[PDB]
């Protein structure tokens, strides 16, 4: 009786939201950006090849200096690279080799990683002893760790396969806030530039916008037909892009609370693993299962170019803070640094 | 290149040397993935031979490292294991169709297309007793079992009841039928009949892994 009545009210509320989104869907992003000129052909060359990983690379993250990056592989090795010289700055042996994510602290003093061990391990890069040591192990997730991102040296946000995201206090080792509401494994998260909000994509084909301080879900974004694997905030924080296994990328708007554009091609039938934006946000770069990285025009939904330099799945990618280069990691155990030439 | 850059580059080469030394050490062991249902009894298979549970056992001076995670997302991590040890409980007729669908997902997974499955049809003693009692009928769950006959080329074990032999080959055929429906030789299923006291499981994995590695080499020698 009461349960049946309540679940009918949820359907009415869903229709109310759907009508509300349709009310503000006066125009389409495609119509708005029809007049602007295309970005042309985007040609990027492999400037650097980072060799030394002996297994599948699962994650990479640039440091804020746009020169150092950390990559994670399932050989149980965290490696910090000097991208300018390809020198290896550090090689961190992982207690659990089944790592799936890695994060570089914005200060550059810490890196984080974690995988099927359900632990987010914090590593101190600046010690008087001259070696990298574990400073914290963040326990509390009941599923694998899929993504992690620092807010500062003391706060980090992690997404897990136990359908929840958590905000952690690194000094005390306790999760101050738990973000619940996803019905599937959360595969990725992206922080807003002001670090007051973050979006997460799960395997329930939905993206949720979370308030860090308040700790609740502000908006829910649906429209994908399969698991979401990647998510990335727009550089101004008012939009984000997702990548799913249905071979499509979608651009959702926070304030309009709906999808604005879909990035798919008929030839593309493979899943998407990673997404990122260029510094101005005009380009959306996505890594694919078909061994390629497609550069999309975010505004016009045009495939601007292709990065074809890997012999296995493109598992991760990232764009530097200064926008100078993009790194691609792959299951073929190599990392490549790309940028164009005049 | 400055004086500090040379010292930095020399540090990088010392890192690269230890990266290769650890990689070669990791290749000296064969990695196995243990899968199965709750009633499979895969733990008992491991214990007799001996978030992630790991066990190391050695057969003829060869080290095996088997991982029992205790799933379409994290199964991609084990994309480069030597073999998958999929265990089922053949006695429980009710959950056999669940195991067949579970096996079908693993076999047809996009990230396990080159991973051979070492099937372990566990708890054969219970299956033999269940058929002997006759209280439960396999035909109730599988209608096609009533029209199935033991192959003439079959080689039953000595002292084995023909009723049990007909049942065992039917259950094995269902898994083999899934295996032979796709793959085209990229991966091969290696079914086995094991019980709760069998102590030859480790050697069966070792012998099957020799064929899995040999099949890997033959593709290298031929697909050039």
């Amino acid at each position: 009786s009461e349960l049946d009545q309540l679940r009918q009210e949820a359907e009415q509320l869903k229709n109310q939201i759907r009508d509300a989104r349709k009310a503000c869907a006066d125009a389409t992003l495609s119509q708005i950006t029809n007049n602007i000129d295309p970005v042309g052909r985007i040609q990027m060359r492999t400037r650097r090849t980072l060799r030394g990983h002996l297994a599948k690379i699962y994650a990479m993250h640039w440091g804020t200096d746009s020169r150092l990056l950390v990559s994670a592989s399932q050989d149980g090795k965290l490696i910090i690279w000097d991208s300018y010289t390809t020198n290896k700055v550090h090689a961190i042996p992982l207690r659990s080799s089944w790592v799936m994510t890695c994060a570089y602290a914005p200060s550059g003093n810490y890196v984080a990683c974690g995988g099927l061990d359900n632990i987010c391990s914090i590593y101190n890069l600046k010690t008087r002893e001259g070696n990298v040591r574990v400073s914290r192990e963040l326990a509390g997730h009941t599923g694998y760790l899929s993504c992690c991102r620092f807010l500062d040296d003391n706060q980090i946000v992690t997404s897990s396969g136990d359908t929840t995201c958590a905000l952690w206090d690194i000094e005390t080792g306790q999760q101050t806030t738990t973000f619940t509401g996803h019905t599937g494994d959360v595969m990725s998260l992206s922080l807003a530039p002001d670090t007051r909000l973050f979006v997460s994509g799960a395997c329930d084909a939905s993206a949720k916008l979370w308030d860090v301080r308040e700790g609740m879900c502000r908006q829910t974004f649906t429209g994908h037909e399969s698991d979401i694997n990647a998510i990335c905030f727009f550089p101004n924080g008012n939009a984000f892009a997702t990548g799913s296994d249905d071979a499509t990328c979608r651009l959702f708007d926070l304030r309009a609370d709906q999808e604005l554009m879909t990035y798919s091609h008929d030839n593309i039938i493979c899943g998407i693993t990673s997404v990122s934006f260029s510094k101005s946000g005009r380009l959306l770069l996505a890594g694919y299962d078909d061994f390629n990285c497609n550069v999309w025009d975010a505004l016009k939904a045009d495939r601007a170019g292709v990065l074809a330099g890997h012999d296995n799945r493109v598992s991760c990618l990232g764009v530097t803070d200064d926008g100078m280069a993009v790194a691609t990691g792959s299951w073929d155990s190599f990392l490549k640094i790309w940028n164009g030439s005049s | 290149v400055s004086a500090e850059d040379k010292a930095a580059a020399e540090r990088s080469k010392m890192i690269d040397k230890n990266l290769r030394e650890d990689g070669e050490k990791a290749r000296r062991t064969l990695r196995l993935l243990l899968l199965g249902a709750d009633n499979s009894g895969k733990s008992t298979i491991v214990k007799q031979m001996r978030g992630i549970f790991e066990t190391k056992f050695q057969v003829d001076k060869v080290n095996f490292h088997m991982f029992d995670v205790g799933r379409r997302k994290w199964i991609q991590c084990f994309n480069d294991v030597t073999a998958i040890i999929f265990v089922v409980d053949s006695s429980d007729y009710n959950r056999l169709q669940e195991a067949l669908n579970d096996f079908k997902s693993i076999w047809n997974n996009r990230w396990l297309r080159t991973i051979s499955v070492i099937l372990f049809l566990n708890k054969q003693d219970l299956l033999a007793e269940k058929v002997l009692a006759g209280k439960s009928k396999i035909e109730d769950y599988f209608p096609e079992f009533a029209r199935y006959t033991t192959p003439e080329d079959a080689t039953p074990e000595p002292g084995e009841d023909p009723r049990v032999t007909r049942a065992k080959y039917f259950i094995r055929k269902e898994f083999v039928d899934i295996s032979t429906a796709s793959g085209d030789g990229r991966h091969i299923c290696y079914p086995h009949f094991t019980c709760a006291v069998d102590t030859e499981n480790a050697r069966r994995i070792f012998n099957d892994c020799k064929d899995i590695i040999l099949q890997m080499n033959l593709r290298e020698y031929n697909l050039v």
Partner: single-chain antibody
Amino acid sequence: VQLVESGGGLVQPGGSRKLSCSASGFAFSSFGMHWVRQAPEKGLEWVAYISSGSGTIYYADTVKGRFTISRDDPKNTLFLQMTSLRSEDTAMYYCVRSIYYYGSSPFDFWGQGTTLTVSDIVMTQATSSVPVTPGESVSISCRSSKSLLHSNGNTYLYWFLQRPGQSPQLLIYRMSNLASGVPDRFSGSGSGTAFTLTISRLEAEDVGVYYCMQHLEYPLTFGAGTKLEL
């Protein structure tokens, strides 16, 4: 972090002596090691360098062929075998650790030193002494015969402070970066061949001799040193 030197003492001219440097509290095998000596009432002089992994070894010209530097990583001991000792070798010998990667701070820790008694880019610090008062800003100037700015953007200039009775301590590495544990009042500014160390709001602890060292190439050379007195 500790670096203890031993084996020094009065030796006859033309003799041989073995200096040891035992390291504790840090990963010794990860750091390159230098020997730096200081003649009595004189400035610092670099002696030798052995890299991490013992693959690269450098000597100063005044000691090349007579000194041998070696390390024992399992025992965390640094060695300096000296032969044909001259009266010019009478100095306090310091054991210095230095690790080299992007953003590292070489020459960050010095040992207490051991005393030995026997019976090229030019770094200039023209101002030998500077009278100072507490709370007042002080500037120290350094000059180099060659430009220390490399094509990679680094300027390999280092600043050290040797308080009376104490071993030198790193203040500024690569001409602008502030060493760990050093107050923010110290600031390093430079360009090309001319460098300035500015000390705002001088305190009693800042009193001492300041040395500027170049790390552009071997042999590493020190300035004469500028002494601060009240």
